Amino acid sequence: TRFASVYAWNRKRISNCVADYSVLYNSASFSTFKCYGVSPTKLNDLCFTNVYADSFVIRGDEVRQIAPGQTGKIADYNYKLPDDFTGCVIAWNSNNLDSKVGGNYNYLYRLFRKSNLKPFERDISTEIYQAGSTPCNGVEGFNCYFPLQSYGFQPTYGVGYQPYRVVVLSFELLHAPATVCGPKKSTNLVKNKCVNFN
Amino acid sequence: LSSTASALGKLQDVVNQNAQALNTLVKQLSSNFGAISSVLNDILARLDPP
């Protein structure tokens, strides 16, 4: 139905499954499919411990922010993506539902600073900014910067600022015996033939 | 010769030097060298030829 905002993305650990990414590749209903680290066409015949799946929504102009080694306002504060094997990135347009709805104060983003966030941490602490020290014009109670502000969207106001629904996967290797594996057939064993095996 | 050992130092030194050189050469086969993994098969089965 609807995922949470960018402050607290839903974090799902998927294990003990039989994954078939083939039914996802052929479905050409995505705006961007920039998956690095693994060639998507050779993903069925490769399985590992488990996956980490999180989902959120961003603007249509910040899609390129989600990539390793990038610098921005969202890639360092809202979601820090480390410079390593971060699976695949999926982003699809959301205009029929997200843009064509009266929930103008349901999608939130942060302008806060001096809060550099390390890879894979969450800061749901919603507090108004009141330093009460020298770096706030020397007066306590002023410079009340609200940490959250809403996506201002209208019915079909453009393309570059349209809401985009983004899911990024994370895979790990050499941590535990493989639990989730693709659909393949198991054959019987042979002895003393110098065979190749998986 | 029967009682006192450690008199054949030179031959032992030669053998140890050769064995240690072979050991470090074999051990050198397990370094990433900046790549993704130290085994060709993993990269072959994970990535694409281009």
Bridge partners of A171, per DSSP, are A51
Our CA-based measurement puts residue B46 at a distance from the nearest CA of chain A, in whole angstroms, of 5
Is residue A46 within 8 angstroms of chain B, CB to CB? yes
Residues linked to residue A166 through DSSP beta bridges, in sequence order:
A56, A91
d(CA A57, CA A59): 7
Nearest CA in chain A to B42: A46
CB interface of A with B, residues 165-194, below 8 Å: none
Which CA distances in Å does A29 have to A5, A25, A91, A92? Answer: 22, 9, 10, 7
Contact A2, A55 (CB under 8 A): no
Gap from A42 CA to chain B (nearest CA, Å): 7
**A45, B45: Cβ pair inside 8 Å?**
yes
| Contact yes or no for A180/A19 (Cβ under 8 A) | yes
Report resolution in angstroms: 3.3
Flag whether residue B30 sits within 8 Å of chain A, measured between CB atoms: no
Task: Give the Cα separation of A153 and A157 in Å (integer).
Answer: 7
Smallest Cα distance from A119 to chain B, Å: 20
Q: How far is CA A21 from CA A45, A66, A90, A121, B4, in A?
A: 10, 21, 13, 28, 71
Answer whether B46 touches A (CB < 8 Å).
yes
As given in the structure block, the two tokens for residue A23 are: 């039914």
- Helix/strand/coil for A42: helix
A187: left (phi over 0), alpha (psi -120 to 50) or beta: beta
User: What is the spatial distance between Cα A83 and Cα A166, in angstroms, rounded to a whole number?
Assistant: 19
Residue pair A156/A95 in contact (Cβ under 8 Å)? The answer is: yes
Which residue has 């941490």 as its token pair? A121
User: What experimental approach yielded this model?
Assistant: cryo-EM
Set of chain A residues whose Cβ sits within 8 Å of the Cβ of B39: none
What's the DSSP call for residue A4? -
CA dist list (Å): A19 to A22, A45, A140, A179, A197:
9, 11, 55, 10, 21
Q: Does B48 touch chain A (CB under 8 A)?
A: yes
Residues of chain A in contact with residue B45, where contact means CB-CB under 8 angstroms, are: 42, 45-46
Residues β-bridged to residue A110: A148
Q: Residue A23 is inside which H or E element, if any?
A: helix A22-25
CB A170 within 8 A of CB A127: no
Structure tokens at B44: 């072959």
What is the rounded CA–CA span in Å between residue A59 and residue A6? 11
**Chain A: closest CA distance from residue B38 (Å):** 13
